[PDB]
Amino acid sequence: MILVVGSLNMDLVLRVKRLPRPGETVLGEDYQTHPGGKGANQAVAIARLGGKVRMLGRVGEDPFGQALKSGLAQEGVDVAWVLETPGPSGTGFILVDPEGQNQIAVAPGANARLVPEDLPATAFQGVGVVLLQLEIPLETVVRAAALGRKAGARILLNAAPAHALPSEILQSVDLLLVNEVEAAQLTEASPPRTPEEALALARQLRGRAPQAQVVLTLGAQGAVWSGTEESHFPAFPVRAVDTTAAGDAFAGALALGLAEGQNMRAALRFANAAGALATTRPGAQPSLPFRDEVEALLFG
Amino acid sequence: MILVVGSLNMDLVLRVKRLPRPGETVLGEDYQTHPGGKGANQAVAIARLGGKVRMLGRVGEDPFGQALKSGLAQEGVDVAWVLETPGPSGTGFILVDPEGQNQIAVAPGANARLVPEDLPATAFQGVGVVLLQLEIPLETVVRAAALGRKAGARILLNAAPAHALPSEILQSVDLLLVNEVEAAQLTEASPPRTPEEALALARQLRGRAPQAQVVLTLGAQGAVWSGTEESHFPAFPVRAVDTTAAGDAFAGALALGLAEGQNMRAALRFANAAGALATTRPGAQPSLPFRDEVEALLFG
Ligand SMILES: Nc1ncnc2c1ncn2[C@@H]1O[C@H](COP(=O)(O)OP(=O)(O)O)[C@@H](O)[C@H]1O
Ligand SMILES: Nc1ncnc2c1ncn2[C@@H]1O[C@H](COP(=O)(O)OP(=O)(O)O)[C@@H](O)[C@H]1O
Ligand SMILES: [Mg+2]
Incomplete structure (x- = not known):
């Protein structure tokens, strides 16, 4: 059983011919609404992947409030903990060029009012894995770590994007999960070209975070694991059609893979x-695989 | 009296730290609904300067629609010719951070449904200047220029934002108004860095629009004018916070100067x-100046 302590955003997606330069105005197409947020994506991905999960966060009392809420439950995810707030929900401002080069900005609204005291013990009860991204406040992450620890959950921090973390918040975490961009401003060295220039950046985190097994996500090249050992996990070779649900469909799946009680090698693969398989379908949440394909891909 | 035929959009302004790149969701503060669109901005720009002005344009049924119409009515814009339309209003996606930086992407909404059939002759009756931009269809620009000239109105085309123009529009216009980028796109020339290069470019644009006065704006270097004179009009020195709507304020003031029977030397200044003055205050329409300020700047 998993607890996502993470963000709930309805996204406004607006296609342009080329992305605007600074100071430049461009006309695009009509925007569309799809549920966004690393947190929500992660819960759906986990349910899709055949697993019991619950969202802890906060939706608005605007129209999109109930859509975030609804769609999440239709996937088969317990939303009992999805606490309603005034103002809008969360909202993301996505500009996609016809190639997939896109530009995302997120209005937190209801995500940035999910407070250190909103977190109630019973959200964390029976939970095997607490999954944290940073599309919710920070003290709500220091506090969500501590309560998941008190409930006997493994703390998985998906840091997306990167900040400066004191070793306060890495002797607290059971697994750190990052992509190239994040690994780069969590160390202040050259972003990883090879799996070697990564497996290094791994020990340069595992350095800060002794008993936190570190996972680093490469794209096209897969991911490396520097913990009980040092390892490289080949990506699956497939048509990079869309990379919405990046270090994200991975995150949900790893969280679910360890929850369901798979060894680290298997949950990484x-x-x-x-x-x-996130990349072979267009869009955020419709791309996020069912257990059917993944379990079928992982034999053929 | 001035008819503006053009766009009405609700500006959504997200206040963020940095502007993004691919596969990297970025976290703002909270979006802030502001009334916008080049057409409504220019119409408001004309009314704040004490101009008689009509807006001909399409807002959607949605709540932004009723808010845009009232907004204009409240500024002294004749909104008799503002049409309600199924679907959503146009929307400004306006990312804005500390230094000011603005990445305007425009969802067209009901603006894209303003068709030639929607321009009735009485909106043109007794109009001295028809003021157009390029956030409505090109077929509507053609028809608006024909109807303006039938009624004896001067046609001012603000060819913004940047767009190829067929010779039917270019041959139809009394004044062609463009910034550096629109100039360069219509001429396949390098954007000019000096009034001397901008006049040469203005002169070249005039070969596509030989019946037109051509005006080319240079932000902090003012504007050049190619037609009955070849001249540079100096920028006013000011503390610039947010260059948004500065073009609108420019287009509206020129329009109004000419409506009032000012020569080009007076109306350009x-x-x-x-x-x-529009550069000195934050945001789009809100930053448009009142005539007493402009008059205070004009003669210190
Ligand atoms: N931007 C990213 N940076 C790093 N790793 C990523 C990124 N996006 C996705 N990943 C993950 O890393 C692995 C390899 O990248 P992926 O996009 O799958 O490449 P491929 O198209 O070759 O399968 C996948 O498991 C994927 O989910
Ligand atoms: N920094 C500035 N100082 C003074 N006037 C300015 C400044 N920036 C813009 N302006 C005024 O706004 C007009 C239009 O500016 P410009 O940036 O060319 O418009 P656009 O927004 O259409 O690109 C200028 O011609 C001038 O009148
Ligand atoms: Mg301004």
Whole structure:
């Protein structure tokens, strides 16, 4: 059983011919609404992947409030903890060029009012894995770590994007899960070209975070694991059609893979299969695989 | 009296730290609904300067629609010719951070449904200037220029934002108004860095629009004019916070100067005063100046 302590955003997606330069105005097409948020994506991905999960966060009392809420439950995810707030929900401002080069910005609204005291013990009860991204406040992440620990959950932090973390928040975490961009401003060195220039950046985190097994997500090249050992996990070779649900469909899948009680090697190859088959379909949440394909891909 | 035939959009302004790149969701503060669109901005720009002005354009049924119409009515814009339309209003996606930086992407909404059939002759009766931009269909620009000239109105085309123009429009226009980028796109020339290069470019644009006065704006270097004179009009020195709507303030002031029977030397200086003042306050329409300020700038 998993607890996502993470963000709920309805996204406004607006196609342009080329992305605007600074100071430049461009006309695009009519925007569309799809549920966004690393947190929500992660819960759906987990349910899709055949697993019991619950969202802890906060939706608005605008129209999109109930859509975030609804769609999440239709996937088969317990939303009992999805606490309603005034103002809008969360909203993301997505500009996609016809190639997939896109530009995302997120209005937190209801996500940035999910407070350190909103977190109630019973959200965390019976939970095997607490999954944290940073599309919710920070003290709500220091606090969500501590309560997941008190409930006997493994703390998986998906840091998306990167900040400066004191070793306060890495002797607290059971697994750190990052992509190239994040690994780069969590160390202040050259972003990883090879799996070697990564497996290094791994020990340069595992350095800060002794008993936190570190996972680093490469794209096209997969991911490396520097913990009980040092390893590289080949990506699955498939047509990079769309990379919405990046270190994200991986994150949900890893969280679910460890919850369901798979060894680390298998949950990583599960997360690779997951966030590869994410790329072969267009869009955020419709791309996020069912257990059917992943379990079928992972034998053929 | 001025008819503006053009766009009405609700600006959504997200206040973020940095502007993104691929596969990297970025976290703002909270979007802030502001009334916008080049057509409504220019119409408001004309009314704040004490101009008689009509807006001909399409807002959607949605709540932004009723808010855009009232907004204009509240500023003294004749909104008799503002049409309700199924679907959503146009929407400004306006990312804005500390230094000011603005990445305007425009969802067209009901603006894209403003068709030639929607321009009735009485909106043109007794109009001295028809003021157009390029956030409505090109077929509507053609028809608006024909109806303006039938009624004896001067046709001012603000060819913004940047767009190829067929010779049927270019041959139809009394005044062609463009910034550096629109000039360069219509001429396949390098954007000019000096009034001397901008006049040469203005002169070349005039070969596609030989019946037109051509005006080319240079932000902090003012504007050039190619037609009955070849001249530079200096920028007013000011503290610029947000260059958004500065073009609108420029286009509206020029329009109004000419409606009032000012020569181009007077109306361009007038336009440079209004443009300068729009840079000094934050946001789009809100930053458009009142005539007393422009008059205070014009003669210190
Ligand atoms: N931007 C990213 N940076 C790093 N790893 C990523 C990124 N996006 C996705 N991943 C994950 O890393 C692995 C390899 O990238 P992926 O996009 O699958 O490449 P491929 O198209 O070769 O399958 C996958 O498991 C994927 O989910
Ligand atoms: N920094 C500035 N100082 C003074 N006037 C300015 C400044 N920036 C813009 N303006 C005024 O606004 C007008 C239009 O500016 P410009 O940036 O060319 O418009 P656009 O927004 O259409 O690109 C200028 O011609 C001038 O009148
Ligand atoms: Mg301004």
